[PDB]
């Protein structure tokens, strides 16, 4: 406003109209624009090139906030292409003297400014078929080759303050290696290698809050340095340098520290393709073991994440090539990668924190998303049918968990692998039905993270026999959770879907079988067993399997009773016991010998070890007796209900065993023995 | 002649020290003001009761206590109480900010600001003594201040007075009286910090005192007032040898030599009997064999353990009343012939008998009756280790989920301290188990 007033009332400000039309009440609102866009426009004139850069170098770069320092560095970078001489002759030497000051923030800002100036000068020289050494005189080359060395001489890399110097040195090394410097064959490269290696060998000593950053800043710096200096000829590298790096990194993937494992895993996924040629199978076999789970590596969930991240990263570097197992993705190594990727899917780890496995199950979902797609853009024939079907089944299964965050990523991955038409995927079970159920037009406006806008759509996949089992397993494990909205939306979608198959017998004879196979598939797992019993209880209480109740001794209930006997027997937690007592009193409705067996099991559970379980079983038995009909004959139901309501189930066992025996005798059920 | 210097820090520590001093003067006849009519020598001090009291040239019998609190609350009660004329203004130190149940906030933050003040008071008081035995510190594991400032003071004393004993009377946490969920962390921390700085520390299971008050005394809701009156009696009975002309545990080193064979195994088990209510005072008088048999009952034990399962390393008993040595010997022989008391193979298996002809004493209007004879049995039993076992159950379930750990990280305390304390506790448990072989 002051500038506008001075330009309107005096008209003596150089380039008042220009700096007034670009910088106004609206354009000035954004700080990034003011520091990068508007800044360059205002500095384009010779009346604002020197003072602006001076203020940026003697104040903004030495701010007390990292964000302001980075913004000033980016501003200087953008303003380094409007003044190459001034940036390489008065500001660069000005920064070389400040990089050695005692202040930490000042040193960091000066290092960032020097790196940005070097990058800008290199970019400017690249557009004139000239080297970068022309602008950066011998003086500049010397100081830049003394930033990392001098810092190590004062053990400045130690401590919290030393972490920021380490990050600054990593960024400087990355910039220098990307700008192509004449540092090939010097001790500076050996010193840089050492610092990068130390940063990853000591990530457990880095703040968890500022950790993931220091690791993605050391791998990036390693990718530029090993692509500008480890190269003897076009498409090759120093045999000696390739034998020491790989041997050192593949021997650190088996470390006892998890942070070092993750660092080396990402340090092996950034290696250039010229340095993996000839020894790609070794690195592949190494990461495969890094993404595996042994009896000792059960809590190493973060290791598998970075392992899978690096694995797919090397597949995209080397690309696909025919007849080249040691250099690229051929047909001789495509199967092992798929097996290693699908070996991490069955990875659910309920550690103190919770499903840490979700992090490993997420990374895998990405590795495939970058693999099947890559081949689809080159050699789609390698995409096998069975492997692709298994991948599509695992994705559909993961797209129905109880975690909204990871259920939104799985749906996005599925949509990215189903709609893909550039070119499309060779083997996708029901690709026409999937396209009709998920219109590409009405997909970008679907909030998969919200259960309401995610469950009603994912439940429609049950119609496909291929994904039927994998979708039912997900719906089951999501129905027996604990969240109210999730369970409500799952039950609503299940009820709105079973209405079209309840009347059809063969439909209720295929879904029921699939659900009973999930019970035999996941028995004593303790992850699917609990939620599967609750789902069965809810389905029985809603009244879905009614056409089968007319038949006596139906195979479905016959096997369900045996599964419940094998599951509920020998337990401890109360939820499983209550969930088992509910399924039993719900299945009692089925007539025949199954009814007598269920009554016997209920009478047995009535005398549980805990009085609470006894009271719950008694209440459920009374409820299922007063609800259903024809379950007790000979007019002996009155005495049964009277002895059930009169007997105190909260007493001792010697006093309730007689009542249990009397109730069994009144119901025509053999009396269990006592040994 | 020698004199000790007692210290009371924290809310639980100072509240118990006040009752102990009240009971001590109640027994010595020292009036609330400090004048002792029974003392005929003015200015001179060389009797048995002088171990816990000094004398001015007017007659006043000042205690040798150090009441330090990090907040003005409990100190004000004693400053404007009944024995405020008993203590001096300098011995009643007070701070401002409270640790708020946090060992880190009291050991590396609000405790490193008042430690020097407490140390200057502990030096001025010692300068007025020709001979010093040790330091009787009273604190509690529940309170974060009692875990931080007490540990810091003990560590500083270990360097300053590096040739003086440091007997302790810690207070163990109980859910029926607790107000913090972080009492296991601070407890384990202070235990690991004091394991290498103390000689003999007696535990006081709050659950045992609550049960004794609800059953024996017949109280519906035992309060901190009733618990302090019952623990003060035991504290006085234990320190009765250091204040009367006896013949057992007359010095602090005697405690360590007769109850602490293994330097790291220094948590004996204390018991006191009988405990009759005031209503049933003039009813029946139990003999020595009656109060010696009940001492072994877990109901009277201070810690909820099972000494019958384990074995003993050392044992002693201190009587109070008209007790005859022959009757005590006969009762001990009968108990040995009846009960199957087992001792360690490498440890001496004998009971240190020490009778005190002085009759018991109780505060007027108290729930405890004026029994004719009482006894305090101190025996080092391995079963007491069980009291620590369950405590670890509260440290693994929480620490596994990293619960309430940020409070210590953000207060300057490191994270490896918890692992070190857990390893020390595991080593102590392993040593206890090995001693049972």
């Amino acid at each position: 406003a002051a500038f506008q007033e001075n330009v309107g009332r005096q008209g003596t400000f150089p380039h008042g109209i220009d700096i007034l039309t670009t910088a106004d009440y609206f354009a000035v609102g954004n700080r990034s624009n003011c520091f990068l866009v508007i800044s360059v426009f205002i500095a384009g004139f010779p009346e604002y090139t020197q003072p602006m850069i001076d203020h940026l170098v003697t104040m903004k770069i030495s701010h007390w906030d990292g964000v302001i320092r980075e913004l000033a560095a980016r501003a200087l970078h953008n303003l380094a292409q409007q003044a190459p001489e001034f940036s390489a002759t008065q500001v660069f030497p000005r920064l070389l003297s400040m990089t050695l000051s005692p202040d930490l923030h000042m040193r960091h800002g000066s290092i960032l400014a020097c790196a940005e100036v070097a990058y800008a000068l290199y970019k400017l020289a690249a557009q004139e078929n000239r080297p970068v050494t022309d602008h950066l005189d011998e003086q500049a080359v010397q100081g830049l080759k003394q930033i990392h060395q001098q810092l190590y001489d004062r053990q400045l890399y130690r401590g919290l303050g030393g972490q920021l110097m380490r990050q600054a040195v990593c960024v400087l090394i990355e910039k220098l290696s990307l700008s192509k410097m004449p540092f090939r064959g010097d001790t500076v490269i050996d010193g840089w290698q050492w610092l990068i290696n130390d940063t990853l060998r000591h990530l457990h000593l880095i703040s968890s809050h500022s950790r993931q950053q220091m690791k993605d800043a050391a791998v990036s710096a390693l990718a530029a340095l090993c692509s500008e200096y480890y190269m003897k000829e076009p498409g090759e590298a120093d045999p000696a340098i390739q034998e020491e790096l790989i041997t050192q990194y593949l021997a650190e993937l088996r470390n006892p520290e998890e942070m070092t494992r993750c660092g080396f895993s990402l340090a092996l996924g950034a290696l250039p393709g010229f340095l993996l040629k000839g020894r790609l199978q070794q690195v592949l076999t190494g990461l495969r073991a890094v993404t595996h789970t042994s009896p000792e590596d059960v809590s190493f969930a973060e290791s598998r994440r970075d392992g899978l991240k690096a694995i797919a990263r090397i597949c995209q570097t080397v690309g696909v090539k025919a007849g080249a197992p040691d250099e690229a993705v051929c047909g001789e190594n495509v199967s092992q990668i798929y097996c290693a990727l699908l070996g991490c899917m069955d990875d659910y780890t309920t550690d103190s924190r919770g499903d840490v496995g979700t992090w490993v199950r997420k990374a895998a979902m990405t590795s495939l998303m970058d693999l099947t797609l890559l081949l689809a853009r080159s050699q789609p024939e390698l995409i096998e049918a069975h492997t692709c079907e298994r991948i599509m089944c695992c994705v559909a299964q993961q797209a129905s968990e109880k975690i909204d965050r990871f259920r939104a990523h799985a749906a996005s991955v599925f949509l990215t692998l189903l709609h893909f038409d550039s070119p499309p995927i060779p083997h996708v079970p029901h690709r026409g039905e999937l396209e009709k159920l998920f219109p590409r037009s009405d997909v970008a406006s679907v909030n998969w993270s919200a259960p309401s806008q995610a469950f009603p759509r994912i439940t429609q996949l049950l119609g496909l026999p291929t994904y039927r089992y994998h979708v039912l397993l997900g719906l089951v494990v999501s129905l027996g959770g604990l969240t109210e909205s999730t369970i409500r939306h799952s039950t609503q979608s299940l009820f709105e879907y079973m209405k079209g198959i309840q009347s059809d017998p063969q439909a209720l004879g295929s879904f029921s079988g699939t659900l009973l196979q999930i019970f035999e598939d996941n028995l004593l797992n303790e992850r699917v067993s609990v939620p599967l019993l609750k789902t069965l209880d809810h389905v029985l209480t809603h009244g879905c399997f009614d056409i089968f109740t007319t038949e006596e001794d139906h195979p479905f209930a016959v096997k369900l009773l045996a599964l419940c006997k094998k599951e509920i027997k020998n337990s401890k937690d109360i939820q499983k016991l209550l969930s088992g007592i509910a399924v039993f009193c719900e299945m009692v409705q089925f007539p025949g010998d199954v009814r007598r067996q269920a009554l016997l099991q209920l009478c047995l559970l009535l005398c549980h070890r805990f009085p609470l379980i006894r009271k719950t079983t008694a209440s459920q038995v009374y409820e299922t007796l007063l609800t259903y009909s024809d379950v007790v004959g000979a007019d002996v139901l009155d005495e049964v209900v009277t002895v059930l309501s009169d007997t105190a189930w909260d007493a001792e066992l010697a006093v309730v065993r007689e009542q249990r025996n009397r109730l069994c005798d009144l119901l025509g059920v053999p009396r269990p023995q006592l040994v | 002649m020698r004199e000790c210097i007692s210290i009371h820090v924290g809310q639980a520590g100072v509240q118990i020290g006040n009752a102990c001093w009240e009971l001590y003067c109640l027994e010595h006849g020292i009036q609330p003001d400090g004048q002792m009519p029974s003392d005929k020598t003015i200015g001179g001090g060389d009797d048995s009761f002088n171990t816990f009291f000094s004398e001015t040239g007017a007659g006043k019998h000042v205690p040798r206590a150090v009441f330090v609190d990090l907040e003005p609350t409990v100190i004000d009660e004693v400053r404007t109480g009944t024995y405020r004329q008993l203590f001096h203004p300098e011995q009643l130190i007070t701070g401002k900010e409270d640790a708020a149940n946090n060992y880190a906030r009291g050991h590396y933050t609000i405790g490193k600001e008042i430690i020097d003040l407490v140390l200057d008071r502990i030096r001025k008081l010692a300068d007025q003594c020709t001979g010093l035995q040790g330091f009787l510190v009273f604190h509690s594991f529940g309170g974060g201040t009692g875990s931080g400032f007490t540990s810091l003071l003990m560590e500083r004393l270990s360097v300053d007075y590096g040739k003086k004993s440091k007997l302790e009377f810690s207070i163990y946490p109980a859910p029926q009286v607790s107000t913090a969920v972080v009492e296991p962390y601070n407890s384990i921390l202070t235990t690991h910090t004091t394991l290498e700085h103390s000689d003999c520390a007696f535990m006081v299971d709050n659950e045992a005192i609550y049960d004794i008050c609800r059953r024996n005394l017949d109280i519906e809701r035992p309060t901190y007032t009733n618990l302090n009156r019952l623990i003060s009696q035991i504290v006085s009975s234990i320190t009765a040898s250091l204040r009367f002309d006896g013949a057992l545990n007359v010095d602090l080193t005697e405690f360590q030599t007769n109850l602490v064979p293994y330097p790291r195994i220094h948590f004996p088990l204390a018991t006191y009997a009988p405990v009759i209510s005031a209503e049933k005072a003039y009813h029946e008088q139990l003999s020595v064999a009656e109060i010696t048999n009940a001492c072994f009952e877990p109901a009277n034990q201070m810690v909820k353990c099972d000494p019958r399962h384990g074995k003993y390393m050392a044992c002693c008993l201190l009587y109070r009343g008209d007790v005859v040595p022959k009757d005590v010997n006969a009762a001990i022989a009968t108990i040995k012939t009846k009960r199957s008391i087992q001792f360690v193979d490498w440890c001496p298996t004998g009971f240190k008998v020490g009778i005190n002809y002085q009759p018991p004493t109780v505060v007027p209007g108290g729930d405890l009756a004026k029994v004719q004879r009482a006894v305090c049995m101190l025996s080092n039993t391995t079963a007491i280790a069980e009291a620590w076992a369950r405590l670890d159950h509260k440290f693994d379930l929480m620490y596994a989920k990293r619960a309430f750990v940020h409070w210590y990280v953000g207060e300057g305390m490191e994270e490896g301290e918890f692992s070190e304390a857990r390893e020390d506790m595991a080593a102590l448990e392993k040593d206890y188990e090995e001693v049972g072989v």
């Binding site: 202040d103 401590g159 919290l160 | 906030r105 300057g412």
Partner: protein, 86 residues
């Protein structure tokens, strides 16, 4: 060590101010306050909150004392027009 040196410098500044009778006394005293502030603002990346609050309170008290000393030793005269200066 940080708390030790801070307390030492605070005691030194207090002793220098208790005996300040020159503008050079107060001017040097007002350059130890700048140094202390610069040190503290460069050490808040590893210090606790209670220590920072104590340091801030000490700095505020020292600044108030310095302002009082400057107002006392150098009593600023009341406002008066420049009419008839000579």
């Amino acid at each position: 060590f940080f708390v030790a040196t801070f307390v030492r410098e605070r005691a030194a500044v207090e002793e220098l101010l208790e005996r300040a009778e020159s503008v050079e006394r107060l001017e040097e005293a007002a350059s130890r306050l700048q140094g202390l502030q610069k040190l503290i603002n460069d050490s808040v990346f590893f210090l606790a909150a209670y220590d920072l609050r104590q340091g801030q309170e000490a700095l505020a008290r020292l600044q108030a004392a310095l302002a009082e000393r400057r107002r006392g030793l150098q009593p600023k005269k009341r406002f008066a027009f420049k009419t008839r200066g000579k």
